[PDB]
Structures are given as C-alpha cells and as structure tokens.
Nucleic acid binder design. Structure first.
Ligand SMILES: [K+]
Ligand SMILES: [K+]
Ligand SMILES: [K+]
Ligand SMILES: [K+]
Ligand SMILES: [Mg+2]
Ligand SMILES: [Mg+2]
Ligand SMILES: [Mg+2]
Ligand SMILES: [Mg+2]
Ligand SMILES: [Mg+2]
Ligand SMILES: [Mg+2]
Lengths: 131, 101, 151, 92, 53, 59, 35, 300
RNA sequence: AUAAUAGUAAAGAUGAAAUAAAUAAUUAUAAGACUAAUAUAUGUGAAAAUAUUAAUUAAAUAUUAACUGACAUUGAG
C-alpha cells in the first residue's frame, strides 16, 4: 500500500535546522527499504511556525521542520513506522494517510496532486521534456 | 464642501456603456442589493473541480474557508456543493489533527 | 547574569460573570538579562519571550466598592468598579507603558467596563490601551453541565 | 541570542487567536464595536450561554431541526417578497 | 534513429526490485489476495471458459 | 539460478555485437534452449501471450 | 508516432512493434530505401 | 405545417436568452434584444408576446427573458436604451479602426497562411483554450481526442517514412513540425468549432467605412466636437488620463497641457457640468468594448 | 484538584437568601470524562444506532460485458 507520512521534526539547533530531519528521514527510509518497502519521494516543506505551542516528552515547541515522505510498504510495516515515530522525541507530530492505488499505480504526493500533478511521471516528464 | 462619500457616487468603468439612470441614487442602491461574491468561483479552488481532501497539508488554502477563530463556514456561506463541503470539512479536521491548522 | 526585571506592558483583565465583576491589572515583567544567562538554548529564549511572566498589581471586585449581594452583578456596580480601577492605575504611576485589555465573559459588567473606558472615567487609560481581546473559555464537548432548572 | 530577540515580533503575533483588535487611538469605541462583531460572527456569546446547562440529545436535535426550518422558511419568505416587489414595479 | 550510452545493470535491477516490491501480494491489501483466490476457485469449477454463473 | 533474464539478454546482445563467445552463452543456450544467438532469437525469448491474443481477436 | 516516437517516456506501441518485427522490419525498410 | 410556421414566427426569431435582466457588472455591449410595440398596439397592451404587458408600462421598448413563468408573470424590463447608445455613436461620425491594422472583418479578403505559421499555437488552443471548462468534461478532451488522434497512427507511420525518412533517422526537431501540420491537414476537413462565436469586428455597432469627410455649410469638418461630462476630479489611479461620459460611452480624455480650474472648484460634483470634447479615435477590443479616446476642448 | 506567584478582603449562589491569605489573575503538574464549528442525521445501518483524526479488517453504489436459467417472494416455529 502507498502511504504518505507528514512529520514535524524538532529544530533544536538553530545553526543546523535541517539536521534532525535528515537523520529522521534516513531512519524511516531504512526501515522501509529493509522490510520490502519502497520510498517513492521525500518532499521537504521547510521550517514553519506551529499553529500553537505544542508539547512532547516534557518539552515545548513553537516551530518545526515539516517534511513529507511518500513510501510503499505493507500494513504491518506501516504500523511499525508509526509506532517508532510516536516514540521518537525528535518527532512532534506524525500522520500516515493511505493513498489509494486502486485506479492507478503511480500517484504523486497530495501536495503535488493539489497543484494538478497527479503522477510522478508527470513531474519527471516536466523536468526532462521541458527542463 | 467639494467632497462626496464614495458610497454616494458611482465610478463608471472605462470602455463601458451607460444610461442616464446610471447617475441616479437608484443605481447606487441597486448595485448594493445585487452585490454578490460571484467572482469567487474563478478564484475559488474548491469550486474548480479539485478534490478538497488533497489540501489537508496546505493550511493556507484551507484557512480561506474558516472564520477568524477557525470555525468551518456553513455551506450557505462557502457556496460549495454538498460533496465538496463534505470533503473540505474533512480536510480541515484532518489538518487540525495533524498539527498544521 | 543579573536579574534585570523590567515592565514591558500591562494587562487589564476583566472577568464579567452573572453575579460579579473582577478587574485585575497586571505587569508583564521581562528580565532583560535572561538572554545573558549561560546554558540557554535558542528554544528556551524564544519560549521565555513568548510567554513572559506576569505580576498582579491591582485586584478589584464589585464588593470592594461596598456593593453587596445582588447589587454586585448589576451595571452600576461594574461602572463604578471600573472607575476605581482607572483611578488606581493613575495613582500608582502605572500609566507609562502600553496596556492590553482582555475581556473574559459576557455578563452585565462587560458593557459597563467598556463604557467606563471609552468615556470620561477612562480618558487617561484609553490613551495607553493598544490591543483589546476576548478570552471567553468555551469547551469542545468537555464536562457535563448541570441539569436545566425547572422554574 | 539576538537571533531569538529579533524574531519574536512575528512569533508573538504568529500564534494569534483571531479574537483581538488593534485599537484605533483616534476612535477607541470603534475598535470595541469591531470586537463585538467578531463575537457575533463566531457565536461566542450564544455558545457560552448554551453551555451553562445540559440539554438531552433528543431535545438538542429537536431545537436544531426547528431552527433550520425557521432559517429556511425566512429565505423562502424573502424570495416571495422580492417577487412581489418586482411584480409591483412592472405593474402586475 | 541512433548513431547516454546504456544504464548500468545494477540500476536496471533496482528498477525491477522497486516494481516487484510495489506489486508484491505480501505488500498489498488482503482484498487483492481474495480477488486472486476467487479467480483460482472459479477456474477449478467452471464448466467452460467464461462460465461465472 | 542467480542469472536473470535481463542480464542473459544483455549478454546475447553484446556477444552478438562483439563476437565474444564465453562458455556462459553455451550455458545460456541451455538455460533457454536458444542454440543460435541472433537478433531474431532474443525477440522470440521475450514474446508475450498478449501478442497472440491480439491476432486471434482480429481473426 | 507510436513505435516511431522520439519521446523518452514512450508507450506500449514501441514494445509491441519490437516483439512483432515492426521496428526492425521498418528500420531495414528505411535503410533499404536509403540504399 | 404548423411546426414550419412556428420556426419562422417572429418569436422564434428572437434567440433564447436567460442572461440576468438586472446585471450590475460591467456592460460593454447589448445583452438582450429590444422589443418595440407600435403606439396603437401599446394602447391595447399588445406586444406580440404570450400575455398582455401591464398597462402601467408607458415605454414602447422592453427586454424580456421568458414568455411565461411559474409565477404567472412575464420576466421583462421596460427599457430599450442600448439603441440610443448606438445612434449616438453614429452621430459622432467616428469610424471604428483597428489598433492592430487587421483586415476589415466585413470584407471577404483573400487571406494566406502568413499567420498559419502558428499551427502548434492554435491546434492546441482547442485543448488549451479551456480556461472555464469542467474538471471532467475538459478531461474528456484527453481520452476522446487520444483515440481520434491514435486512429491516424498508421497513416502517419507511413507518410513520415515516405516523405521525410531522414528526419526519422536524424532528429525529431522537424518531425514535430510534420506532426502539427499532419493533424491540422487532417482536421481542416473535420469540424472542430467550425462555428466561431467570437465577436466579428465592431459587432454591429458601426458599419461606417473610414475615409469619408463631413461636408458642412461652414466647410469640411476637421475635428468632431461632442458635448460630454467629466466623471472624476482626479485622473484614473495609475493612469495619466481622466474619464469622460460622451454619448453613452466612457472615454479616456487627454488634456492639452493643464486641467481646467473648474475641476478643483467643482470637486466631486464635476459631473454636474458639461464640457466640449474632441473624439480622437475609436478602437474595438476583443471583450467587445469600444475604446474611445477624447480631448477636452476648452474655450480659448 | 494541587502547588507556586504576586495581589488582596470578601467570594459563591439566588426571584431574594441561606447552608456549605480565599475568589479572580499568571504559571506548572495530574486525572477522568466528553467531542465546537462544519451539520442537513444530509448520508449510512436490519433496527437499536451512527458526525475530532489516522490506520487495519469486513460490508456497501451505478453502468457495461459475459454467465447461470425461476435458483423467487413471504415466512409459523
Ligand atoms: K438519517
Ligand atoms: K428450464
Ligand atoms: K420458502
Ligand atoms: K418467528
Ligand atoms: Mg443578579
Ligand atoms: Mg450537582
Ligand atoms: Mg483561582
Ligand atoms: Mg460537532
Ligand atoms: Mg433521511
Ligand atoms: Mg425472510
């Protein structure tokens, strides 16, 4: 099944804002590819201010690095990833939503589909045929 | 006084045709009565054919259909179809649960 | 490295219930040497300046002006209590920095406080008020309220 | 450091609630009128009153059904009055 | 019509591995497995090709 | 058999374009039974049933 | 174009012509014409 | 038969129109057909519609949408004022000219493919001119077309290897050109939007040909003087020209050097006074509007 | 509810009342229950019921093609 993970990583060090996010993406990506899974895309969303002050593991946060990770894995692996994300102190909020593949095998991230790009081929073919 | 409130004077656009009635107060009142946000459709993503549920990770677009406090606007105000209102409300509720809205 | 407590603004909070009106005047104190402390992260600094400590200066109710029992929740009791507050803010030399007004509920004293602040009684305080806001606390589901009264 | 000092203005107003008004130093009574409009457009006073006492779910449903009907009934009434006025203007 | 060379075989093997992981029955919903079972069962009982009723 | 179709079809198309005849090809001539290594032998190793169906349907 | 297309992302036409001796029976045909 | 007669009846001649009779947006041209009744018929409330128009109506011109409705009334507005705008334009004797120097749309000119060198610009305009098309009916232009275009694959798989084989073996820069031409050549026979709904030229506002001079008892008229009104007392924001109301049209007035002092004096009541203007040129835009340029002739 | 903080003398309740370093304010911690707007229970479900989010499993729609060939309806117990 195709899944779309949206994780809000903590920005502890203002000098290295994109450090825990890279370390976290590698940890999650390794779980997926080591359990028969495929990572289709990793779309960084940048540092954004949280809608409110949020708390996690007896800590407070006012900003986080947003990132999206579209990956293919089994239901059991997807639950394992979610369990690890709900326990990692780095992660402030994490959501995994299923992306239906009943009609087509290649679906882009919701962010891209919102912009009219329904498949990764459309995104790649707009970076080769026109770039 | 050489000044009039904007609400008491009509500014005729350029290139348009007019009648003598367009200088009357009736035109002012008639324009107020029939003043509807009909140009929203062309600027309303959710009235274009996109699925509102694909915007659950884009709080900026979703924030256009909630009040200042975050209350989802009734379909009477948004003017969306039943399906889009249903999908838009789900998107906003999902966005709130993820920690983005 | 040294406590440098300084006032940044004042908060005029009014709680307008059905039976009384409470008016609290507070100072948002900021230790201007907090960033000079050792072992302080960027998050702790930003978190300290996003919710600065507050100190209560004036606390008044309608019973402090002699209104008793049922008269405490009336329009006149709130109007006079608001005046006494606007006077005590000038008699304590607390009208130098900007004031933020926070209203909490919608009892009969809410419109008396507003009238006393947009009128002669609050012609000094209103000049310093920079932001007005509402802080009415609502519940999304939450605890079960008491049963409807059969009267 | 100063990085945490020069980025507190937006941060302070980035976590807004939507129930605040910047007072107009000229007409301070117009800002309180604006705040009241927000309260009424978010039904803050009505919601607070409706949360004072518990109402049974069946009664809540009945009240919601009746209110919707009255809202819809008024829209139908206004539609018919507009037709009357239009008909009168044209001499019907 | 020819006259970027060719892709390394390791890269073409990884494209195959991605396609076989995405299409693995062990990574899909249980309903897909049941759909395959229905086809298998139908073919063991059908009177002729196309007999479904 | 670690040997894969793609790799095997990449040796029958390089040996047929370079002239090399490593014993792997003889083995490949047994893995698939393709004794002769020509451009018209890889095309008959990769034939898909769908192609036959398309012609039966036209008839 | 189908089989005779220049797109990097082609369709099944190209793979069908290959296995149907069309992309080869046309390449020779074009080359024979050039001769 | 009765059906044949009905199709040719005067009511059938009026094209179906459901556009709002009360429109508060920008009006650039007439939207409804004006209906006129004679004085004798007006005396008997006869307009040639289904039902008698109420006697309160004293005008002899109206515009309508529906002959009858569920409210048992006719939907009409007793006004015919777009005709006076057209006749006032005729009295100003300013021919409409093309600012792009295009051929006159009212003459059957022998045109050539000079502009047809943009075959890929307009052949794809059929699928790309979908600014206001449904999200799925516009998507039906993708599969419906693909099948139609995919049915010409065999024809283009032989023509291209018989007319330009070199390009198929060298580069596709020219192949793409042969593709755009192929479809158009195979589409000119087809009928895709064979009827074009775009406004043709002036749209009927003026059928006057430029060139003629106006003879007058005081000699040939060299400059057309028309009374008008200044609407704003401050030039259009972001534009170096004010706005005038001349003959039912809003024009852009250019002043010689300075703005007359009556502007500051009058202020927002400037529209209460009538000035004399000179109509420099009149153009027609694609939206169907008329771009009238004037000049505030001031007594000197 | 508890603790801290300054700040005070009343607070709370009612038709009016009276029974049992506070109230209010700003922080921190804990617990249980509940689910604001959207919202029409529209819809869905056999009924009872069902409206904070996600996931897993199960079921549910229309048309077309092919197939079975009355295999249906109702239903005491
Ligand atoms: K229902
Ligand atoms: K039978
Ligand atoms: K039976
Ligand atoms: K029974
Ligand atoms: Mg009372
Ligand atoms: Mg009790
Ligand atoms: Mg307390
Ligand atoms: Mg709700
Ligand atoms: Mg129903
Ligand atoms: Mg039964």
């Amino acid at each position: 099944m195709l899944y779309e993970l949206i994780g809000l990583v903590r920005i502890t060090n203002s000098n290295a804002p994109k450090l825990e996010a890279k370390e976290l993406s590698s940890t999650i990506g390794k779980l997926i590819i080591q359990n028969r899974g495929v990572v289709r895309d990793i779309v960084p969303m940048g540092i954004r201010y949280l809608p409110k002050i949020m708390k996690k593991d007896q800590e407070k946060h006012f900003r986080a690095y947003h990132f999206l990770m579209l990956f293919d894995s089994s239901a059991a692996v997807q639950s394992e990833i979610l369990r690890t994300l709900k326990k990692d102190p780095r992660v402030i909020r994490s959501s995994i939503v299923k992306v239906d593949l009943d009609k087509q095998l290649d679906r882009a991230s919701s962010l891209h589909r919102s912009l009219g790009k329904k498949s990764i081929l459309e995104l790649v073919n707009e970076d080769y045929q026109s770039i | 006084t050489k000044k009039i409130d904007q609400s008491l004077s009509k500014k005729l656009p350029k290139g348009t045709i007019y009648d003598p009635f367009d200088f009357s107060m009736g035109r002012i009142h008639l324009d107020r009565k029939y003043q509807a946000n009909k140009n929203s459709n062309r600027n309303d993503i959710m009235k274009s054919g996109a699925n509102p549920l694909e915007f659950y990770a884009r709080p900026r677009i979703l924030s256009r259909y909630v009040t200042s406090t975050g209350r989802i606007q009734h379909r009477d105000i948004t003017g969306l179809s039943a399906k889009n209102q249903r999908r838009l409300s789900k998107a906003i509720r999902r966005c709130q649960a993820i920690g983005l809205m | 490295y040294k406590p440098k407590e300084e006032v940044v603004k004042y908060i005029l909070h009014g709680k307008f219930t059905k039976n009384n009106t409470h008016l609290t005047f507070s100072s948002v104190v900021e230790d201007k040497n907090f960033h000079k402390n050792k072992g302080l992260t960027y998050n702790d600094t930003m978190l300290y300046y996003l919710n600065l400590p507050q100190k209560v200066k004036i606390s008044l109710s309608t019973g402090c002006l002699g209104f008793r029992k049922a008269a405490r929740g009336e329009y006149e009791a709130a109007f006079q209590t608001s005046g006494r507050m606007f006077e005590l803010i000038k008699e304590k030399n607390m009208l130098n920095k900007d004031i933020e007004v926070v209203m909490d509920d919608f009892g009969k004293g809410r419109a008396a406080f507003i009238s006393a602040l947009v009128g002669k009684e609050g012609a000094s305080v209103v000049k310093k008020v920079v932001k007005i806001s509402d802080a009415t606390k609502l519940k999304f589901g939450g605890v079960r309220s008491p049963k409807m009264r059969r009267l | 450091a100063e990085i945490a000092r020069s980025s507190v203005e937006n941060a302070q107003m980035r976590f807004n609630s939507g129930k605040s008004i910047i007072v107009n130093k000229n007409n301070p009574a117009e800002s309180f009128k604006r705040l009241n409009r927000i309260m009424f457009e978010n039904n803050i006073p009505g919601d607070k009153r409706s949360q004072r006492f518990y109402m049974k779910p069946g009664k809540v449903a009945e009240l919601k059904r009746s209110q919707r009907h009255r809202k819809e009934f008024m829209m139908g009434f206004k539609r018919l009055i507009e037709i009357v006025k239009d008909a009168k203007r044209k001499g019907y | 019509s020819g006259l970027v060379g060719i892709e390394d075989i390791e890269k073409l093997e990884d494209r195959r591995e991605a396609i076989l992981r995405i299409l693995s029955m062990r990574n899909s919903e249980n309903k897909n497995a049941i759909k395959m079972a229905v086809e298998l069962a139908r073919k063991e009982f059908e009177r002729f090709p196309g007999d479904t009723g | 058999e670690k040997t894969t179709l793609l790799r095997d079809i990449r040796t029958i198309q390089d040996a047929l374009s370079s002239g090399s005849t490593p014993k792997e090809l003889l083995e490949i001539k047994q893995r698939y039974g393709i004794q002769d290594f020509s451009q018209e032998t890889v095309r008959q190793l990769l034939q898909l049933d769908i192609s036959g169906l398309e012609v039966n349907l036209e008839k | 174009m189908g089989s005779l297309s220049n797109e990097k992302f082609f369709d099944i036409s190209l793979v069908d012509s290959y296995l149907n001796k069309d992309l080869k029976n046309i390449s020779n045909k074009i080359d024979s014409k050039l001769n | 038969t009765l059906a044949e007669l009905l199709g040719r009846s005067r009511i059938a001649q009026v094209a179906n129109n459901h556009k709002p009779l009360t429109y508060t947006g920008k009006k650039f041209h007439p939207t409804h057909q004006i209906i006129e009744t004679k004085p004798s018929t007006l005396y008997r409330q006869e307009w040639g519609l289904k039902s008698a128009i109420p006697s309160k109506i004293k005008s002899r011109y109206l515009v309508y949408n529906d002959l009858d409705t569920l409210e048992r009334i006719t939907t009409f507005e007793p006004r015919g004022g777009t005709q006076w705008n057209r006749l006032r334009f005729q009295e100003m004797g300013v021919p409409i000219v093309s600012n792009i120097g295009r051929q006159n749309p009212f003459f059957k000119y022998i045109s050539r493919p000079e502009d047809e060198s943009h075959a890929k610009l307009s052949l794809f305009k059929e699928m790309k001119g979908d600014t206001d098309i449904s999200p799925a009916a516009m998507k039906k232009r993708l599969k419906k077309i693909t099948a139609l275009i995919r049915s010409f694959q065999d024809e283009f798989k032989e023509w291209l290897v018989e007319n330009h084989p070199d390009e198929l073996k060298l580069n596709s820069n020219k192949l793409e050109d042969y593709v755009v031409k192929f479809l158009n050549k195979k589409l000119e026979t087809k009928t895709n939007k064979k009827f074009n709904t775009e406004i043709i030229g002036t749209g009927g506002l003026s059928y006057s040909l430029p060139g003629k001079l106006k003879n007058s008892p005081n000699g040939v008229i060299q400059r057309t003087v028309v009374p008008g009104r200044i609407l704003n007392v401050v030039k259009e924001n972001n534009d170096n020209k004010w706005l005038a109301a001349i003959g039912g049209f809003v024009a852009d007035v250019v002043f010689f050097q300075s703005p007359p002092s009556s502007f500051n004096s009058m202020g927002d009541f400037i529209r209460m006074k009538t000035f004399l203007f000179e109509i420099l040129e009149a153009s027609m835009e694609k939206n169907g509007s008329v771009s009238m340029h004037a000049r505030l002739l001031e007594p000197q």
